[PDB]
């Protein structure tokens, strides 16, 4: 399997920018907290500190140079995360610093559900990839709350030992969930029993800022110790550590597509790794005019070549990038 590791590590050798946008305003903070594609990858949404969710049509963006959002939604507070529904093309969730979990029609801007149970800042939301009605959120109140789109109040809650910074549903089960906690660990639960975690992954020295599913069998986590960590669902300790980037403080973003991992860095750059090798595959350096990349996401086009992703730094600069 070594030769396949080689061919996969040398698959890409260059990067090409396709577009450049600005999330901003009065020279204020314009950090982009979240970037997510809709189900068909026709549109992508951008959310950050300016309290605004901006939606863009992908095909319109990568043509001409002048980029106005297809729909812009003003919010009450600063936004930390967004997530599109895998079942409903217009359903798009958002979490803010008030602890609110708002369900949006990403186009009409209407509000169908406003969930207000979190008592402190909410860091992450995510839709269940195998249940259309379910979604989840995690907050600084050491709580992971489960929501149903057909109900006003939460259906269940997992009580953690410290702050919850990121949540994610498994892409292979409607009952498996994972979240990264301030206790430097990654917790893995079967929502049927929440007493009672399935696994607690130890290895990080700082709070687990990010946690994504590479697949149904492998998780990738990002923590503020300049470390990415690859875990197996069955092994309580990491399979491989990815170093080379600088992530000691901020939510710099983490994204995974198939066999490739991308994360931001505090030298104003995006780093790309292959999940079976610890060394950096390649790096893209943002221009500048203390700046850190803040959000990344793969354009995971079903049945195709995930050669393109979107990254965004703390300056509000957003770039669509194709791997050559």
């Amino acid at each position: 399997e070594f030769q396949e590791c080689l061919s996969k590590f040398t698959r890409y050798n260059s990067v090409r920018p396709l577009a450049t946008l600005s999330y901003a305003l009065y020279n204020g903070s314009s950090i982009v907290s979240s970037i997510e594609f809709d189900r068909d990858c026709d549109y992508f949404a951008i959310a950050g500190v300016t309290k605004k969710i901006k939606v863009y049509e992908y095909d319109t963006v990568i043509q001409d140079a002048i980029h106005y959002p297809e729909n812009e939604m003003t919010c009450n507070s600063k936004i930390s995360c967004i997530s599109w529904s895998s079942y409903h093309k217009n359903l798009l969730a958002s979490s803010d610093y008030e602890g609110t979990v708002i369900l949006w029609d990403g186009f009409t801007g209407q509000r169908s559900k406003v969930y207000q149970e979190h008592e402190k800042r909410c860091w992450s939301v995510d839709f269940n990839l195998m249940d259309p009605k379910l979604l989840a959120s995690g907050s600084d109140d050491a709580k992971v709350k489960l929501w149903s789109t057909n109900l006003d109040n939460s259906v269940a809650s997992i009580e953690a030992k410290a702050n919850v910074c990121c949540v994610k549903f498994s892409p292979s089960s409607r009952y498996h969930l994972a979240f990264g906690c301030a206790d430097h660990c990654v917790h893995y639960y079967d929502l049927r029993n929440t007493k009672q975690p399935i696994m607690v992954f130890k290895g990080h020295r700082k709070a687990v800022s990010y946690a994504k599913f590479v697949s149904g069998e492998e998780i990738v986590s990002a923590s503020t110790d300049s470390q990415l960590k690859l875990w197996n669902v069955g092994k309580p300790y990491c399979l491989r550590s990815f170093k080379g980037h600088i992530n000691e403080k901020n939510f710099v973003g983490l994204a995974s597509n198939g066999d490739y991992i991308a994360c931001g860095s505090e030298n104003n750059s995006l780093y790309l790794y292959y999940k079976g090798l610890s060394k950096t595959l390649l790096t893209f350096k943002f221009d500048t005019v203390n700046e850190f990349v803040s959000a990344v996401c793969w354009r995971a086009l079903p049945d195709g070549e995930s050669n393109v992703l979107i990254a965004a730094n703390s300056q509000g600069t957003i770039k669509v990038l194709e791997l050559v």
């Binding site: 907290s33 500190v49 910074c165």
Partner: peptide, 11 residues
């Protein structure tokens, strides 16, 4: 500012 990851002691 914002986007500051939390931190646990633990004493």
């Amino acid at each position: 500012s914002d986007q500051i990851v939390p931190e646990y002691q633990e004493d």
